[PDB]
Ligand binder design. Structure first.
Ligand SMILES: [Mg+2]
Ligand SMILES: [Mg+2]
Lengths: 346, 211, 208
DNA sequence: TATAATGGGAGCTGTCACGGATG
DNA sequence: CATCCGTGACACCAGG
């Protein structure tokens, strides 16, 4: 019914670890990584492929998919081939495969045991743009990173090292996803710094600060125009479905006129313009009308050069330029006489 | 062993070892199988009775279960469990919908239509109407499950700049962004070896995003 | 959209279809000979019911501080069999130790010792098992040293060991089985012929 | 990147008819 | 063959 309730119930199944169980799991994970490295030393294969095969066998055939960094599409046939290449090893070599399998099996439970910490940390990041469950999943990703980066020799409990990566992942997610118009993480840091500076300035001034006071409190390089540009660049969009009125029959988008598609007046004026241009070009000879049409793009879109029009009509570029000039002159004369094209110039 | 070498325990002379005072005791429903030679199956493998365990084929499997190679105790343990295929979600439902012969079920429901019970005849008719809709139309039932979510053309969910130079946009963009973020996080969680709880939560959130 | 066009085609109710679609229960597609009554296809298994079938049944119990176990590592167990003076197992199967907090090493020691006894008290044999009577004395007898040196008294659980050394070099190794009360302390100086112990009545081998 | 940290928190208050579920 | 429950639907234009 309530997905947060359901997740908090599934999390309450894996029991918390006693210090001994925690240290044992971390040690198995580290020794399994070492064993994967040794297996890559022996086999000459790629360590990532080996880790993926061990991980697949520990998880089962329920999850077998292509890994981006792997050069080979990881399908059960290839994982069986590589598991056979690993099975055809001496005893003192296959012991490393055993160690790797148990290391992956320990990594799984090490994550599942501390999944509660992610919830207890992510509950404090609500309201900042992401759903509770999105925060929880990003914290779980951070927890995976912390598992793969832990070192049990330092005698620190796992929570101390895990909280750092959990916070890191939650904050990176908030920075990367909480804006419809995505803003780079450094610019989000700058905009948050600007917000906090303005807030402290208002807490000391009894009013909202101006651009100049914020630029003061921001340090060197910050003028008023930079503060204004930073505030403008951080404006989030508003919903086209925003309600207008108490009755449920008006949206904010209902009042935004469409500027892209031409109006009936625009299309009709363009059509009459093309027709009047053809009427004015027919008063020329075929060659000079065609020269202007080729020089301006009314034929094939683009504008040709004097050399192209001259080689197309079989004259010198000077001659094609002279007949273009006389065509324009006859058009100017006809326009001064009839004035049939002036109103189109606005 | 220990963290640093000056904390280890090295046996001074010949002797036998005895374990006492455990932190906690674990009672498994498993089956022990000690071994002496090169073991043929690694940890996590699923095995049925009569399968080769270790020692070139000497020791074999007695029960259904999962392999726990124990190099410390030098025993190939097996904990009772079958390789039962049980899924969750639209994946399982799409499987069941794909493996569905429409004519066979139509025949079963027609047989059910001759039952003396009125409610059973009614429910057989209600099922058979859907069956015959799919039959006469040509639509596969599994198509009721989405693999490729369509995306509406952008001009029908605009990102427009209002007179004030600010932007106004449609809600479908935020719903699609929810969907895409959750989908990408699921693809990455699958790329890595994320455990069951996490992947399950992610798939549930993805389904509710599509909803 | 009730009645569901998916739940109707598969004879799945609204509740079951929600439980499967939004990840609350499993649905079997090929039970591979599972048994919970054997598992029939299209059966709703809960999370506990799925883990008991896919990953086996187990449990872990806490031992209070300093309390030793009443069972041993790797040994089978019956349900209800008390695993410890404060732990009763709820199931049957192979018990396992997680973290032994005390390792006891019984070291092997094969040495050579001596002992002098009156002939009318001996019980002649080619060897002596533990607990076996070595002699029976009608009167107290004083086992006397046969070397001069410093006493290295090494008491076992029952019975003792005496070693004499002149210049820190071992010169005699005597054995005092049960029934012999050593009359010397560690590091004592002894001349030839002085009482090192007193046997009284029966004397037998120690159990260790 | 390392002390330890291990399960959330609102909710806020029609009126009828209809078809399906259950009991 | 009933009761209970979840889910639909509940006037138009105007200005907002
Ligand atoms: Mg400044
Ligand atoms: Mg209106």
């Amino acid at each position: 019914s309530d997905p947060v309730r359901q997740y908090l119930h599934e999390i309450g199944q894996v029991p918390l670890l006693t210090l001994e169980e925690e240290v044992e799991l971390a040690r198995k994970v580290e020794e399994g990584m070492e064993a994967i490295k040794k297996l890559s030393e022996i086999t000459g294969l790629d360590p990532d492929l080996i880790r993926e095969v061990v991980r697949a066998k520990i998880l089962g055939s329920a999850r077998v998919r292509h890994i981006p960094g792997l050069k080979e599409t990881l399908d059960p046939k290839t994982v069986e081939e590589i598991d056979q290449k690993l099975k055809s090893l001496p005893k003192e070599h296959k012991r490393y495969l055993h160690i790797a399998r148990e290391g992956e099996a320990a990594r799984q439970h090490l994550i599942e045991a501390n999944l509660r910490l992610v919830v207890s940390i992510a509950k404090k990041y609500t309201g900042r743009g992401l759903s509770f469950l999105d925060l929880i999943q990003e914290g779980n990703q951070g927890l995976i990173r912390a598992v793969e980066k832990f070192e049990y020799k330092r005698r620190f409990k796992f929570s101390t090292y895990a909280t750092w990566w959990i916070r890191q992942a939650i904050n990176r997610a908030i920075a990367d996803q909480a804006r419809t118009i995505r803003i780079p993480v450094h610019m989000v840091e700058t905009i948050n710094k600007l917000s906090r500076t303005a807030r402290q300035l208002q807490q000391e001034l009894g009013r909202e600060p101006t651009y100049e006071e914020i630029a003061e409190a921001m340090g060197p390089g910050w003028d008023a125009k930079r503060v204004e540009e930073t505030l403008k660049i951080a404006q989030e969009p508003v919903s086209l479905e925003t309600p207008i009125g108490d009755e449920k029959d008006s949206f904010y988008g209902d009042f935004i006129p469409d500027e892209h598609l031409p109006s009936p007046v625009d299309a009709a004026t363009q059509s009459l313009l093309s027709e009047e241009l053809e009427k004015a070009l027919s008063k020329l000879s075929e060659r000079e009308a065609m020269v202007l049409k080729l020089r301006k793009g009314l034929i094939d879109g683009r504008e040709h050069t004097l050399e192209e029009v001259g080689a197309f009509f079989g004259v010198t570029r000077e001659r094609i330029r002279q007949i273009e000039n006389k065509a324009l002159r006859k058009l100017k004369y006809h326009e001064s006489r009839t004035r049939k094209l002036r109103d189109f110039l606005d | 062993a220990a963290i640093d070498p000056e904390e280890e325990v090295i046996a001074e002379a010949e002797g036998v070892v005895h374990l006492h005072e455990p932190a906690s005791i674990l009672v498994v429903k498993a089956r022990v199988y000690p071994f002496e030679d090169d073991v043929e199956v690694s940890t996590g493998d699923r095995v049925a009775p009569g399968d080769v365990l270790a020692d070139g084929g000497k020791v074999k499997s007695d029960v259904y279960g999962r392999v726990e190679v124990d190099l410390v105790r030098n025993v190939v343990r097996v904990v009772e469990s079958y390789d039962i295929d049980a899924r969750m979600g639209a994946e399982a439902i799409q499987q069941l919908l794909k493996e569905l012969d429409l004519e066979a079920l139509e025949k079963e429901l027609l047989e059910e239509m001759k039952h003396p019970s009125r409610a059973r005849r009614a429910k057989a008719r209600k099922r058979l109407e859907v069956v015959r809709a799919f039959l006469d139309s040509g639509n596969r039932p599994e198509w009721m499950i989405l693999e490729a979510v369509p995306v509406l053309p952008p001009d029908l969910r605009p990102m427009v700049q209002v007179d004030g130079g600010r932007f106004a946009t449609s809600d479908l963009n935020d719903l699609y962004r929810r969907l895409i973020n959750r989908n990408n996080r699921l693809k990455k969680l699958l790329a890595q070896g994320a455990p069951e709880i996490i992947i399950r939560n992610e798939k549930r959130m993805l389904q509710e995003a599509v909803d | 959209d009730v009645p569901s066009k998916i739940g109707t085609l598969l004879d799945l109710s609204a509740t079951e279809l929600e439980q499967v679609l939004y990840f609350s229960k499993y649905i079997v597609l090929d039970p591979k000979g599972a048994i919970l009554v054997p598992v029939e296809k299209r059966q709703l298994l809960t999370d506990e019911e799925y883990r008991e079938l896919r990953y086996g049944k187990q449990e872990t119990y806490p031992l209070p501080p300093g309390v030793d176990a009443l069972v041993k590592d790797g040994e089978e167990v019956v349900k209800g069999q008390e695993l410890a003076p404060g732990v009763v197992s709820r199931l049957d199967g192979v018990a396992l130790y997680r973290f032994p907090r005390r390792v006891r090493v019984e070291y092997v020691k094969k040495e050579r010792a001596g002992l002098r006894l009156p002939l009318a008290a001996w019980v002649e044999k080619e060897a002596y098992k533990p607990g076996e009577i070595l002699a029976e004395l009608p009167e107290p007898y004083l086992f006397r040293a046969e070397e001069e040196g410093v006493v290295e008294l090494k008491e076992l659980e029952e019975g003792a060991f005496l070693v004499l050394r002149r210049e820190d070099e071992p010169v005699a190794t005597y054995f005092l089985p049960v029934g012999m009360t050593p009359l010397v302390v560690h590091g004592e100086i002894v001349e030839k012929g002085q009482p090192l112990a007193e046997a009284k009545g029966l004397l037998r081998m120690p159990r260790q």
